[PDB]
């Protein structure tokens, strides 16, 4: 009876949580931003096409200098491109061909990748020998790992498909903190601009806000109806946008603790694979399974443009730190720059 | 208007592209096979008698077979990675009858997957020596688990091995029929199923995978050449 008593107490606390969320709902984001003049039809054209990969591209990441970018593909290679001149700066062969994530360090020295081998491999680019040598392999996850994000040169947050995230210290190799609490495969994560708390979306239609320093889940966000497989912070770190398999994006809010706005259209029935914001925070770009990307007005829920031109499913998407480009990589082994 | 360092960076990029073209020439002529099945299937004793990855060769053709078993039971999220493989090798322990409907449900879940809508399945009905011994024993009947076996007679168009009882042949062709009923009810022309019977000490498995992949690529070539 104690199991049933604690279950009744847990559902009563979920009821009072929903009560506290509905108490603070005084308006709608589509209601306050009625008077804003709209964006207009945006025509972003393809500037560069980067053609070097042999199989489907699964992840990319921009460098912090907004010029170099790393990209990982299922033939078992990372390629580091100079996106201004389309030069291949580096070509790193991987030990396992099944790579599902990619990360470029914010200092430029290191690159991380991982996949179905349950191992986050970390590669040192600036060696004294001229080649890209594997710095170290972090191995403590029991499922495949889905997303990597560097914090420093020495610590990295890893999402995995054994319903858990982790914080690794690379100088040692042992994971310092384990963030348990999900129930499905954690598909993506996104760090705050000050990198002291991050957010994660899993396959149980739930997004959790973890604190990096202490280690507890701070908040939980439950609005979707399928697997959240993309997440990205608003540029001031007080909101985020999730994309799932139910053809909807939506914008959750950290301070009001609830969803603000849904980005969906009735002619869209395929799932979102990738989500990012622009530099000011108005163009929520989202990659879909119908082979193109959509630019949603992040204040009106209006659609404002299409970036078509990929023959296959758009798998990865990213905006530079100066806001001057958008790179989309897809399953037809191509990356494309748009502004 | 390039500089000296810019021209040398372009030359480095060109040599990287040369090595990538050699890697494409190697990668195009190899055959990836997603191997799966249940825990009692004898799935690993097929590939040890012929570990994530495994490479082998039949008539100077390279096969690269990979068993993904390091994760948990939810296969619904990593199986999007293998949607351009050559074939799926599904291994079934066909001697324990109480775990046979689970294998049929798993085969129905794989055959009707939305990422595997163009992937053919090579089906190995493993451990038929135990099936022959359990049928010739007569202590475990198949109509306790599959009652339509009380009404099933073996067809005259079968190919019985030399020495087979009619009872073993009836059991074998009933199990094969139970899988090809699922395989012939969806996706006609997009992908086929190739059912083979296998022992534990059987040695013809690499030749069987070779012949079935030959037929798979022949049908893919008939489709893509506007020729079907």
């Amino acid at each position, epitope marked *: 009876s104690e199991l049933d008593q604690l279950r009744q107490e847990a559902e009563q606390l979920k009821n009072q949580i929903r009560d506290a969320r509905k108490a603070c709902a005084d308006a709608t984001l589509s209601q306050i931003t009625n008077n804003i003049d709209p964006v207009g039809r945006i025509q972003m054209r393809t500037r560069r096409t980067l053609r070097g990969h042999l199989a489907k591209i699964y992840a990319m990441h921009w460098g912090t200098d907004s*010029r*170099l970018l790393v990209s990982a593909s299922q033939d078992g290679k990372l390629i580091i491109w*100079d996106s201004y*001149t389309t*030069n291949k*700066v*580096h070509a790193i062969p991987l030990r396992s061909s099944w790579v599902m994530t990619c990360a470029y360090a914010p200092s*430029g020295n290191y690159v991380a990748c991982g996949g179905l081998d349950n191992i986050c491999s970390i590669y040192n680019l*600036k060696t*004294r*020998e*001229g*080649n890209v040598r594997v710095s170290r392999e972090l191995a403590g996850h029991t499922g495949y790992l889905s997303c990597c994000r560097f914090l420093d040169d020495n610590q990295i947050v890893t999402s995995s498909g054994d319903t858990t995230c982790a914080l690794w210290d690379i100088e040692t190799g042992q994971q310092t903190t384990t963030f348990t609490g999900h129930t499905g495969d954690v598909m993506s994560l996104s760090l705050a601009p000050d990198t002291r708390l991050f957010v994660s979306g899993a396959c149980d239609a739930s997004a959790k806000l973890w604190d990096v320093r202490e280690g507890m889940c701070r908040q939980t966000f439950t609005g979707h109806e399928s697997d959240i497989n993309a997440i990205c912070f608003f540029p001031n770190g007080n909101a985020f946008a999730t994309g799932s398999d139910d053809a909807t994006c939506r914008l959750f809010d950290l301070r009001a603790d609830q969803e603000l706005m849904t980005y969906s259209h009735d002619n869209i029935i395929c799932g979102i694979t990738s989500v990012s914001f622009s530099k000011s925070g108005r163009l929520l770009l989202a990659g879909y399974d119908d082979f193109n990307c959509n630019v949603w007005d992040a204040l009106k829920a209006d659609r404002a443009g299409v970036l078509a031109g990929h023959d296959n499913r758009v798998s990865c998407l990213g905006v530079t730190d100066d806001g001057m480009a958008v790179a989309t990589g897809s399953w037809d082994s191509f990356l494309k720059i748009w502004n | *208007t390039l*500089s*000296a*360092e*810019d*021209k*040398a*960076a372009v*030359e*480095r990029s060109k*040599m990287i592209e040369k090595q990538l073209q050699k890697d494409k020439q190697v990668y195009r002529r190899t055959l990836r096979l997603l191997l799966l099945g249940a825990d009692n299937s004898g799935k690993s004793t097929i590939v040890k008698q012929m570990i994530f990855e495994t490479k082998f060769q039949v008539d100077k053709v390279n096969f690269h077979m990979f068993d993904v078993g390091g994760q948990r039971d939810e296969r619904r999220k990593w199986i999007q990675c293998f949607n351009d493989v050559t074939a799926i090798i599904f291994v079934v322990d066909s001697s324990d009858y109480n775990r046979l409907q689970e294998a049929l449900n798993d085969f129905k879940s794989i055959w009707n997957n939305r990422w595997l809508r163009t992937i053919s399945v090579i089906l190995f009905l493993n451990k038929q020596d135990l099936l022959a011994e359990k049928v010739l024993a007569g202590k475990s009947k198949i109509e306790d688990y599959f009652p339509e076996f009380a009404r099933y007679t073996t067809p005259e168009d079968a190919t019985p091995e030399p020495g087979e009882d009619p009872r073993v042949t009836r059991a074998k062709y009933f199990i094969r029929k139970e899988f090809v009923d699922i395989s012939t009810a969806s996706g006609d022309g997009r992908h086929i199923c190739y059912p083979h019977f296998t022992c534990a000490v059987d040695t013809e498995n690499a030749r069987r995978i070779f012949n079935d992949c030959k037929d798979i690529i022949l049908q893919m070539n008939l489709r893509e050449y506007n020729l079907v």
Partner: single-chain antibody
Amino acid sequence: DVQLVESGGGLVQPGGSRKLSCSASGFAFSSFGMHWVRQAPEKGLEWVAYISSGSGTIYYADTVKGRFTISRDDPKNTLFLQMTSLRSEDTAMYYCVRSIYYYGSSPFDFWGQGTTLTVSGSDIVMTQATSSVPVTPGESVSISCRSSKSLLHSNGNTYLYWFLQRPGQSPQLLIYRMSNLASGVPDRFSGSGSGTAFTLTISRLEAEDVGVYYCMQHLEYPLTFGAGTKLEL
């Protein structure tokens, strides 16, 4: 450990022939472009040859064009310089230099040991007008190097390199592309300048910072050095 060691020097009669070779132990030799850079017995140092990565590009100075040749052996990890028609102006010391080129790389970073060889025009004129500046330990010294053509390329990079040669050994890359410090240099060196006028500044100069400092342009081939600026106590 990264090292280049060259041999094949010695005394040669004039007009003859001689071969030099540097063996490279400790780095990926097949992806580094290679240079031969020589230095007269009492004068500053000058650039004689360059072979590319994969040998797809070979450049020579005008003095040795036609009578020298340079060739690499990538499995055996060696670089050769075959010299025919030797004059008495080829008495020098020869250095084997590695240099790798991509976006943000550090060319000319490691220099060889040097063979002592004894024998019996629309350029970029790099001008270092000084020859000797007296120093005291714990003072900031500024060394100028004036170009003739503007080294500021249209892509923003200003190709100017500063090397240090201590008394008794091979040069060492201090700064590259007029601002960036090389890996392993103390942070007291700083590179300033614009277009044609450049400055290397040493703050709180120690006793191991003595030698001759060379500036080198990498905007166009041939790569022209400076005359050096000695720093004695």
